[model samples]
Target: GAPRGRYGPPSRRSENRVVVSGLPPSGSWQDLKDHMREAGDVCYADVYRDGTGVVEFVRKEDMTYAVRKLDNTKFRSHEGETAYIRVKVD
Candidate 1:
């Protein structure tokens, strides 16, 4: 169940969520987290098996910052292989 708001009902709301695709296949969670941390405080990071993922930030502007700085940048995996990351607000 979702957490309840102060008004006593689940707050069915979302913010600062973005989908990031094209991550390096060998990239690890720590790698992504560290990369995103350079832009802002990451609230949540969900990576998929296909190297696509979503990242949520504590502040909306932080997400915007991340998007501006990270989009089209190459992400290097542990093996030194690189892939481009694309971010889109979801």
Candidate 2:
């Protein structure tokens, strides 16, 4: 069998959202949402098995905060490798 998981509506692009990548494969949408809340309210979150993801915020300002603060930051580190993730405003 092949690998598979869950995701949210990705085509619904909006200004109050962000494109997030380079996440840990073991991470989930809920984790993304919780982490993103560091910047502001995260209304929705979607993540793929390949580490691609989207996080929608309650306000565009929140998205901007996420874009600037969350960009190129460590999301999850494993095996001593402190990997970072990228965030782009959608």
Candidate 3:
């Protein structure tokens, strides 16, 4: 096949969630959640200890909204570091 897009779906037992990676070094789960709040309701948000995280919305629409809205914005960590954010398959 030719080149592919960014993702494939979850293949095994996993939660129906979207993982945002390359997050800014200082941002927090709340920041991500707050930013997403502008779009609509966000049920759950988290930033992992390993510098990766996932957000679980009550509906896929909210997840899609948050993913698209926050696509290319600057996310900064709590200690002031630039972090990139993107929605990835999980």
Candidate 4:
């Protein structure tokens, strides 16, 4: 078979949510939520102690847009530092 793209076969479990990694410890939930909302309607958003996070959107298309817009992008923290974040469909 030929080489695969950045993504492999789609997984059923990731259809409604997206995984976000590389969040700055200084980042706030509100800021993350606001950033996520810019791409679509967010049903839920949270960051773990390890700095990784998850965002669930009301629609799959919203999740798609969010992942595309947020992956490997700079997220400005509350203290004005920028953290490169990556968003992936779970």
Best candidate, TM-score-wise?
Answer: 2
As a TM-score, model 4 comes out at 0.71
What's the C-alpha lDDT at position 51 in model 4? 72
Clashes of 2: 0
Q: After superposition, which runs of candidate 1 have C-alpha atoms over 4 Å from their true positions?
A: 1-13
Instruction: Give Cα-based local distance difference scores for all models.
Output: 0.71, 0.73, 0.64, 0.73
Q: After superposition, how far is residue 74 of candidate 2 from its true place, in Å?
A: 1.2
lDDT (Cα, tens digit) per residue for candidate 4, span 48-85: 64477766778888888876775677776778787888
Q: Report the C-alpha lDDT of model 3 over 1-90, residue by residue, as the tens digit.
A: 799753334444234467777776567787878765654676767775536766666665655666677565666556756666667545
Q: Which stretch of 10 consecutive residues in model 2 shows the poorest summed lDDT?
A: 75-84
Across 1-90, the per-residue lDDT of candidate 1 in tens digits comes to 988642223233366767788877677656777776766788666675556866677878887787788678776678868788887776
Q: Distance from true position, residue 73, model 3, in Å?
A: 1.8
